[PDB]
């Protein structure tokens, strides 16, 4: 799962569908669970998925979630501003 007490333990693919504060410790855990190549690939689809609202049942829902988290991660790496991550709003 996503937490083990007060500690964020989630992987990129699990966390992208969840809610957590993206701070440096969460970032470290996410970035070490996915390749830089795959992260860029998902991040490149953010413009497509930016205003996604399709339900969690939809088949493109991981893809939307992956885009959103990857963009959040690209942002943190540039600004280092801790921020709440929430999945594409359905």
Alpha carbon gap, first and last residue:
21 Å
| CATH fold description | DNA polymerase, domain 1
Strand order of the largest sheet: 1-2
By DSSP, the count of extended strands is: 2
Globally, the shape reads globular
Helical residue percent band: 40-55%
What Rg is obtained from the alpha carbons, in whole angstroms? Answer: 12 Å
- One letter per element, helices H and strands E, the order comes to HEHHHHE
CATH class: Mainly Alpha
Major sheet: size, sense and barrel closure? 2 strands, antiparallel
Question: What is the number of independent domains?
Answer: 1
So, the CATH homologous superfamily?
Coronavirus nonstructural protein 4 C-terminus
- Compute the number of helices: 5
Strand fraction: 5-15%
Give the name of the CATH architecture: Orthogonal Bundle
Give the class from helix and strand content and strand pairing.
mainly alpha
């Amino acid at each position: 799962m996503l937490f083990e007490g007060d500690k964020f333990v989630g992987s990129f693919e699990n966390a992208a569908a969840g809610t957590f504060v993206l701070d440096m410790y969460a970032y470290e855990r996410l970035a070490n669970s996915i390749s830089t190549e795959k992260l860029r690939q998902y991040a490149s689809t953010y413009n497509k998925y930016k205003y996604y609202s399709g339900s969690a049942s939809e088949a493109d829902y991981r893809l939307a979630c992956f885009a959103h988290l990857a963009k959040a991660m690209m942002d943190y790496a540039s600004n280092h501003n801790d921020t709440l991550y929430t999945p594409p709003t359905v």
